[PDB]
Amino acid sequence: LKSLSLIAAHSHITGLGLDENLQPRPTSEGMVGQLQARRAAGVILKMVQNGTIAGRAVLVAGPPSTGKTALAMGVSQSLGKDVPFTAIAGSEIFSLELSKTEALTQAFRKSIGIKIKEETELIEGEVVEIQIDRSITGGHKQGKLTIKTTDMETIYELGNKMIDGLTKEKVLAGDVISIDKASGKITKLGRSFAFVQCPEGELQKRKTVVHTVSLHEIDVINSRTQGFLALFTGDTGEIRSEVRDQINTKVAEWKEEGKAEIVPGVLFIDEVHMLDIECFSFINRALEDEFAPIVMMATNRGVSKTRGTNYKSPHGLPLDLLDRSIIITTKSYNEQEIKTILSIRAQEEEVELSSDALDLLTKTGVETSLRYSSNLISVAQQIAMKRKNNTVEVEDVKRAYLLFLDSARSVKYVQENESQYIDDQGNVQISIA
Amino acid sequence: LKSLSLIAAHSHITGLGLDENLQPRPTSEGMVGQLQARRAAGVILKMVQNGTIAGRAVLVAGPPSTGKTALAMGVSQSLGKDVPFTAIAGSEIFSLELSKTEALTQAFRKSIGIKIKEETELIEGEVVEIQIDRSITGGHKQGKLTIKTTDMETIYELGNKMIDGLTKEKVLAGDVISIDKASGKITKLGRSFARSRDYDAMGADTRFVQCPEGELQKRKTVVHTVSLHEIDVINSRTQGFLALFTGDTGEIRSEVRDQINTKVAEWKEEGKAEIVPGVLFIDEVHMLDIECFSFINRALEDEFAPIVMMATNRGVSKTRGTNYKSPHGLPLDLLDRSIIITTKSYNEQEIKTILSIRAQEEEVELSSDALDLLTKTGVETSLRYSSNLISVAQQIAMKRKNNTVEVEDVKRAYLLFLDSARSVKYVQENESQYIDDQGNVQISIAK
Amino acid sequence: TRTAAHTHIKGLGLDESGVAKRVEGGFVGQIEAREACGVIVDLIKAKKMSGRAILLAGGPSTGKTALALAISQELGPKVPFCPLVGSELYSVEVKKTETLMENFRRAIGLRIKETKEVYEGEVTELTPEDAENPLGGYGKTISHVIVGLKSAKGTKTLRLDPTIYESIQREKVSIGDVIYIEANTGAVKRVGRSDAYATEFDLETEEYVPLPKGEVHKKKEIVQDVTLHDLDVANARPQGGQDVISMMGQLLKPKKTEITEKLRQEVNKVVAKYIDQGVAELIPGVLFIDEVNMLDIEIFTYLNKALESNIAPVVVLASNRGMTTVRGTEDVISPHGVPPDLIDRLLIVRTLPYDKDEIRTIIERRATVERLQVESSALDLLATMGTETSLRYALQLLAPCGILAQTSNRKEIVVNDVNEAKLLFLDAKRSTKILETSANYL
Amino acid sequence: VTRTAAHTHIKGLGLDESGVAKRVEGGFVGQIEAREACGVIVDLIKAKKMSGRAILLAGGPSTGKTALALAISQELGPKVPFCPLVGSELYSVEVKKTETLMENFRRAIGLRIKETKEVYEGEVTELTPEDAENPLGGYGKTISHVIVGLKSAKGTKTLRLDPTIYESIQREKVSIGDVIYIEANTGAVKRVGRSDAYATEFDLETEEYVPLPKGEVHKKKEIVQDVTLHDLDVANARPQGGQDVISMMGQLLKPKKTEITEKLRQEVNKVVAKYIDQGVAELIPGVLFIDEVNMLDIEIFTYLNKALESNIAPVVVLASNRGMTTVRGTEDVISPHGVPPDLIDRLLIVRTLPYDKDEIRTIIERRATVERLQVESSALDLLATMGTETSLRYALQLLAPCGILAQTSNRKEIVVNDVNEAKLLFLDAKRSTKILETSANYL
Amino acid sequence: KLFKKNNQVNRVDLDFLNLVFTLNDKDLTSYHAEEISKLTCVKNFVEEV
Amino acid sequence: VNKLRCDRRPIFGKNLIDLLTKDRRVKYDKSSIIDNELIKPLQTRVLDNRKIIDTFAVLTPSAVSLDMRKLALGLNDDSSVGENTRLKVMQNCFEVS
């Protein structure tokens, strides 16, 4: 809530949309079709919410336009809060100043999270009067405060830290403040009549405090003194394995202690069809690690030459990954399913579509691609408002189609437009004669 | 004259050989020939002096030793001082510490320069005496100090804040100090000459300068010739001058470049600072990487784009960074937004005139027939070879001690030092003697 | 008054949501192209759609960069505009991914408007308002502080609660010196002494400010604009003057590291906290990347990943390429060098060359911008040679033509002057021809 | 005692006053042409008028390129600066090679500077500031300028001393009665130690008890020290150091090397021109010698194409030992000695020559004299032969084992048996590859 | 100690010779240097001579 | 003394101190904003993250070399740096917080 979410291709989807028996509905919670894909996503969701097992990774593949990252975003938002989810681009790991392997280790460690619980006490009430006893030279200030609520009205002496805090900020006796004795923080809630705060109930309460923390930040702050600034800036790396396994043992004994509970998150890695065999071997090893969070791995390339090896590795991946990784495959969408997805998008972005206009938009999306339809349904809004009506007509979308080209038709055009452009050598005819 | 007088490759050319109507005399200014090239170079120089338009590039085409570098440096000399001229090489830009785009950014920045003027109002005067009632009344009694100059002298009141200011930079009078009228900051320059005999040895602080002449406070404007790149550096770092001298620029981000451009525009519209047209020259640009080509193509359209000079002797050859070839070894995109000047080899008359002027620059007296045979060598060999031949013949002559360089002197100089053709022939006929490329060479002499 | 083959473009040359005029804003031809451009500009002004990309394709001399400058001009200085090239992505200091991310966050900008009442002027008088404390005490008890303030054409006396004494202690101003006061938050600020007091002391270091213009009390508006990238840098870079980290910032080489994503999400959260309150407001920017062909496949994949973000502004791509091998994989040959995955995710516009009449208009408009005039004969011959040689060769010959006309003292150009201008300088085709006809390695 | 490493047998070219090289002189036998050309190059460099010239030496190995380079370096003299350089040495890791080679170019030329300073000595008794009897209304009379009467046995003077020199005095923690040494200009403070008068005060003391050095208080000395240009370059770019905390921090800031801008170089050039007009300094030229140039990157060749164009470029002599070789950093650029023609257009080619049997005999006997080792005629003939058919280098390497085999046999002369045993125990490249041809597993 | 042999006999200070100007900009305005250079007052010692 | 004056006086800086202090200076006035509270500087971040930094700092460098810290900067009883340089750096480090 209260967070920015602009119009995006993954904003419309909200949750997986599948029953308690994990049979998805044909159109529910943002997705249309891909029933087997959605039920597999629910399978992964129950895997991650169980949390008993670790070291699980999956392959989602197929041609483009199959909603792979759509399903990834759906399962991520189904995870929602109370669980960390990390999405990392495959090409992002390539760094020249940061070691690839330990950066990958900290990428895994970011997914793993630790929740620590503690109970703190606090006093809340309406301030009554402000009185202090200090000296101009000798200091030794002795402040006193009268606090009140709906039932209790009492006076307390104000210690040196509290009087310093009360002086450091402009305070009014009509203000309502909350103080935690252990930490000494001052929480100025509101003000009395000059003015929103109206305290009630017990004067002093005790409440629990929970910190959602990932193992990665423990590791970086405990690696060295400058770990704090490295975390807040990103200029870290090459963390020694000694602190690594020491913190691993510490969190293991804390988990068996019951003081704090671990939450093994989900890691998302993308377009790994372009990557290194170093990465493949290291993740092959790391999947067997005891502290291995569930890893989501996505790809789009079929058989191709894996970078770092001469041979064309099948599926763009080495066989060792395929030995330990389970595959999830997604099919295409029918014309009716594409129309339903377009209707869902239109409802999300609130543009009126004519029935014939929407039908021809669907047929031309099936003809060319659905990304083309996604951008056409956006430009149709401005085409329709330039004629001063939110409804999008057939002429709006046809004007958009004749205005913007598709990839295939532009390819054919440059086939008839070869001479006007340089070749791979660089030969062009800028002239006309 | 302020630079080294050591004879460079072209120590005989000083400026441009054109007239007011841009017509080159056949032999003038120290460079001979290249009449069309001279006229084109003068056109470019006149346009630089105009400075009304920018974002243009110019290239010179010709074989080695044709005068491309000679023409470029003659144009630079005719440009004169106080006009920012930057000369860089296509090889040095490959920096292991700086990005090539960032290095090219500084290369463009240094070419353009800015003149900034500033006015100062300071009070200059030798102090006569200081009397402060620090004990009778104490607490900054507003004492009176008398200040003298060679033409006038007045007494100045001292305020409480002035009492505190004079408490620092303590002066016991008998000393020439100056205080800024605006900021009230006092600078202790040096004592009077009467203090020279106080002690035999003094430290590096005590100095004895003359009393300031004229009125007490004076107005003076100071103009600075400061280009954009150094301002970028000094704004990037708390102390940017050390980075300027050492070169540790730290890859200045482009975020401050827009701010400095806006400040430059503000000073221009206010009249505080004015820009000066600049010239950028790169030699042997034929070797270059395609990222640099793309960045040059982009930056040529910016408003802050000085004229860029290229030199290249390569024919249609491959460009570095790509497998395919191109004219001049340069992409056609650069050739699209550029003007190309053609230069040719000198004839025997031009060659002998060049030899004579080079000998005059070397202060080497020659003979007529010696000059003829040297010209024959220069036409058979390259032009740069006969100059070295006559250079060595000068010392062989002074070994012989018979004034002018002799015919047999040049003959023996040529005999002792192999030409490129003779060297190649000797290498080919003795490829066994030399270590071949494959790594095989005959070491034994007896068969 | 200087330019570099530009500044003759005046926006897009459109009309009120209609068809653009044939020759408007320094434009000729490409009416459909610049109408689509105006559609793009309207989409940007909508500030609703996120992560939308577009690429324009064509040959050389097609004026793609001129069109991009047209978008930049039509946007206005208020809307941020960040030009970019694929060459600078390859950075020695830091990875290309982080440079792309920073150039991405540079386009977006944040605006904040601030309101505050101001009391200012010369302090005419200072006096406390003594009263009786509720609890009996022999000591004094002040209930208010009355300050007499004098500004231009107006004076004011204001009561202040005696808590203002701490502020006046923090300021150390007594009388004859101009101060600064704000209504609600209180506190005092000292600007300088009254200008009329300069004659009291012959020599002093204190510049005496004049009486503030206008009334004593004022209410002015504060408007500030900052890009989210600048806020990221400020929240990341350390600042200090004495602490050890302060000169650890110094005595070293300050390098830009990869900013942690937690800092970015936290600054997004605080931007949300200040935009729902109304203090802040977000306007999307645009990243203009030309010659995108030079970028590697890694950059293309990261763009594919990042175009779906919800702080993703519109990004415009410029390239003159077509069926060309993609950098990174020789086998993969894709249109405009960009892999088709991005192309499906963006829109594409085709650009066409210019006709003889359009080249004539370009030449004449450039001459007018240059403030140099061309007669009919030279204009016609220059148009013909530009049609046969190239656009840029005709475009860039105006300065040599002008200087040569100036040498002959004629204000305008003539036939033999432009003939000489052609003679001195050769174009790419002539250069290539003399290259093959020369055996001297030239 | 006497150490020899393939050199010290040559004492320069040693040419005649007419420039003709005699047959045998200074470790050189024959080789008239190269020695005469080298003497001509010496005449070039001693002219002190020309700059930017360069020359390359060519030929097969073992012909004495290193010998000739060392000969010209020796005959130039230690006063004349020389900068040896190897091709592999150029490739650095902190800064690009252009800065390194400009650094070497500046290092080539030198400049001697005339300077005069003042000398002071004596023991210390007084630690008092200026009394300043007149208060003047501004001084609570006291100053960080300690007046010390410099008690030398031959003279005494009270000096108003800077806070820095008195701070250095406090650094030495001087007391009453100890010799001190101070400078008029720099104020450098060094103490030889406490005086011998206080020696009897302490039965033991870490501070050394020293007598007062003989001499007047104020003494004046002049120096004409020669300092190369690039030491001043690095000193100007980076301050060398100082005893103060501020200088400690300043030199703690940036001790690593980076590029050198030309503006400081030109300002230094102008002030040196002012000095030579004053006569304070006189410039001397420089020589730069580069080893094994065939490996240089094409970028280095392109930059050196314009490096000689600069007026500050001194004479640079070059050596290469390749034939038809492609230039390193290139693909199809093949040329003699692996160097692009654009560079060699301005260069001068000189070629070394092989030698006849008598020359091998002469060099072998010269070497035997160099290591003061006496050999018989038959062993000399065998060494000369096997050197002719195998190499000079192999014979030179096995010269010492022959003497060792003689010594372990209690013989002071090398015999036929000695060289035969050395050949039994050592094999040259030819039989090395002969053995390695018939290898079970690359024997 | 083996390195601190007397070098003052053959060392140049180079600081009194105003060749360390890179540290001079720390505490020097340009116009102050310009005016203090032109006040190189000769003949004041020569008149005493 | 005459030659000392003739040599010491011609000491001129590279560009200036007024130039750097005027280019560094900005004509913009204060124009205070909420950015002071918005930034929450790094030192304040360390101050406000006290709870986490004290609850998640457990390990120790099980081995350390005593007195090597003094020699890391070179300050000790016997060193090439000045006698009271070490005293001054120790004192200012005592005041530096």
Ligand SMILES: Nc1ncnc2c1ncn2[C@@H]1O[C@H](COP(=O)(O)OP(=O)(O)O)[C@@H](O)[C@H]1O
């Ligand atoms: N079932 C679905 N529901 C909603 N949107 C979908 C669905 N399937 C696909 N999409 C759309 O298709 C796009 C898929 O893009 P992505 O998953 O990133 O890669 P690919 O195009 O290769 O599948 C998403 O942006 C999403 O909006």
Ligand SMILES: Nc1ncnc2c1ncn2[C@@H]1O[C@H](COP(=O)(O)OP(=O)(O)O)[C@@H](O)[C@H]1O
């Ligand atoms: N105008 C000229 N007058 C005299 N000598 C010239 C002239 N132009 C070139 N030279 C000769 O050419 C040589 C330098 O050639 P250069 O111009 O550097 O080759 P490139 O054209 O490859 O840069 C010098 O030795 C110089 O004597």
Ligand SMILES: Nc1ncnc2c1ncn2[C@@H]1O[C@H](COP(=O)(O)OP(=O)(O)O)[C@@H](O)[C@H]1O
């Ligand atoms: N509509 C137009 N009217 C006039 N000139 C134009 C127009 N469009 C482009 N130009 C010209 O094109 C030039 C910019 O071309 P550019 O975009 O850099 O080349 P390309 O499009 O081949 O990359 C400008 O200098 C401008 O003069």
Ligand SMILES: Nc1ncnc2c1ncn2[C@@H]1O[C@H](COP(=O)(O)OP(=O)(O)O)[C@@H](O)[C@H]1O
């Ligand atoms: N003409 C010569 N006279 C005397 N010694 C020679 C001669 N030629 C070579 N040498 C010997 O060769 C040795 C150096 O060989 P070097 O020059 O390094 O081989 P390269 O020819 O491969 O450079 C010297 O010790 C020297 O004694």
Ligand SMILES: [Mg+2]
């Ligand atoms: Mg996907």
Ligand SMILES: [Mg+2]
């Ligand atoms: Mg050249």
Ligand SMILES: [Mg+2]
């Ligand atoms: Mg363009």
Ligand SMILES: [Mg+2]
């Ligand atoms: Mg050798």
